[PDB]
């Protein structure tokens, strides 16, 4: 009778609902897009912009940053709760939104770890990942940033059922 | 003898398929669970194999490590992408695991599987770029020496191997 969809798959009703996940997803979309944009403007990664130590081993990074990365990662895989469902109401649905937000969470956490280890932001990371110069990569990232801002605000169609 | 006709109550079209679709296309929680088991096995084998041989799994499988991502074999990249999308349920998460009317439940197993998928993909990317397997990576990450990190990894290996075999309690429902 009880669904196993809470914290770490529990059935006790503890943990995030799909709505909470969606919200955190929106915040992640905005944060990630603003990280990319911000690096485009300032030429520095978001951690360096916030004046957090970079180009260092993970264990020397700020514990709050590390716990934020852990939180983001565990959130992306729904380990903090995935309660209830999104159903079609009898062009993006709220589930699509949820997955855009999960992609955002993944990419964000990734770029953060990368900036901790190497000292380079998501843009430079993309350049080294692909081997394509920055000037050719910025128009695509800008399109991505716009999409993230759009999705972050887009309500999405469908309702949430416990 | 003849059954009373039951009236069609509004149907529930759930958005839990491939990238959240409702058309019923994508993995079920059972599929995800299986792929998760495969990831547990692969990850534990990577950690153990490196622990014994001192070489990363990609080095063992005769793949170029210490290269940029784009120069890497496209099947490896595709496997990593597949694992990452699977971990977040992007490839489908159809259905539910429910309690049956004291070990791991099927859902717990699913999440151990997703953690395994995450860690595996990360370790593979890292080995591609740096040329160091998961164990060496852990050593650099934590700053804990190999000798002090090995027992904890072995524990994690045994944990993943047992979980991979364990079916978990509960049943699957659409
Ligand atoms: C550094 C990160 C620290 C925070 C860890 C978050 C753990 C998840 C708890 O979830 C909460 O549990 C309630 C129980 O029902 C829900 O009702 C509620 O929606 C949700 O907010
Ligand atoms: C560190 C930044 C990110 C952490 C935020 C996680 C909190 C989860 C709560 O859920 C959301 O909270 C809002 C207000 O409580 C509501 O507007 C929204 O409807 C609800 O779904
Ligand atoms: C608001 C979105 C996220 C919060 C941003 C706050 C991060 C600002 C951190 O400041 C930096 O903290 C360092 C400690 O690591 C100090 O060493 C350094 O001198 C200081 O500049
Ligand atoms: C990429 C590495 C992993 C390979 C499999 C990925 C596709 C999902 C297949 O589904 C699973 O296949 C098993 C085959 O026997 C079944 O037992 C099981 O019931 C079923 O859920
Ligand atoms: N690629 C990326 O981050 N690759 C590596 C870089 C070193 C750290 C590990 C990952 C992309 C760039 C940022 C956007 C998402 C990933
Ligand atoms: N990995 C890392 O920093 N720590 C762990 C992550 C789990 C698997 C073992 C390594 C990084 C990922 C890519 C950048 C290089 C290492
Ligand atoms: Hg240190
Ligand atoms: Hg490159
Ligand atoms: Hg429910
Ligand atoms: Hg009959
Ligand atoms: Hg190249
Ligand atoms: Hg270190
Ligand atoms: Hg269902």
Curated annotation (Swiss-Prot), chain A:
Transmembrane segments: 27-47, 61-81, 98-118, 133-153
Domain of life: Eukaryota
Annotated Sequence repeat ranges: 1-89, 90-162
Recorded topology in the membrane: Multi-pass membrane protein
GO process annotations (BP): photosynthesis
Gene Ontology cellular component terms for the protein in this record: chloroplast thylakoid membrane; photosystem II
Compartment(s) where it occurs, according to its Swiss-Prot or TrEMBL record: Plastid, Chloroplast thylakoid membrane
Sections of the chain in a coiled coil: none
Keyword annotations: Chloroplast, Membrane, Photosynthesis, Photosystem II, Plastid, Repeat, Thylakoid, Transit peptide, Transmembrane, Transmembrane helix
GO molecular function: identical protein binding; phosphoprotein binding
Modifications made to the protein after synthesis: The N-terminus is blocked.
Family: Belongs to the ELIP/psbS family.
Entry protein name: Photosystem II 22 kDa protein, chloroplastic
Origin species: Spinacia oleracea
């Amino acid at each position: 009778l009880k669904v196993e969809d809470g914290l770490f798959g529990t059935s006790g009703g503890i943990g995030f609902t799909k709505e909470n996940e969606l919200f955190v997803g929106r915040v992640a979309m905005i944060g990630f897009a603003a990280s990319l944009l911000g690096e485009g403007i300032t030429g520095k990664g978001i951690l360096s912009q916030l004046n957090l130590e970079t180009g260092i081993p993970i264990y020397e990074a700020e514990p709050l940053l590390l716990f934020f990365i852990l939180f983001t990662l565990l959130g992306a895989i729904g380990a903090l709760g995935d309660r209830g469902r999104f159903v079609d109401e009898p062009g993006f649905t709220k589930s699509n939104e949820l997955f855009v937000g999960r992609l955002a969470q993944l990419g964000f956490a990734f770029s953060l770890i990368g900036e901790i280890i190497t000292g380079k932001g998501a843009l430079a990371q993309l350049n080294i990942e692909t081997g394509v110069p920055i000037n050719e990569i910025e128009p695509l990232v800008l399109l991505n940033v716009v999409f993230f801002f759009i999705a972050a605000i887009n309500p999405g169609t469908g309702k949430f059922i416990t």
